[PDB]
Amino acid sequence: IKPEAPGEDASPEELNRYYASLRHYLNLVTRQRY
């Protein structure tokens, strides 16, 4: 499952921020944890 992140370029650095937007979303979404 993906948050559909490779929708920019994902070559110069949208893949780094692919894991970063993924990580930011991750860090966020686990807001409730349970």
How far apart CA 14 and CA 7 sit, in angstroms, is: 9
For 9, the enclosing helix (H) or strand (E) is none
How far apart CA 23 and CA 34 sit, in angstroms, is: 18
In order of 10, 15, 30, 31, the CA distances from 7 in angstroms are: 8, 10, 24, 25
How far apart CA 20 and CA 24 sit, in angstroms, is: 6
For tokens 């949208």, what's the residue? Answer: 14
Helices (H), 1-34: 16-29
Indicate which technique resolved this structure: NMR
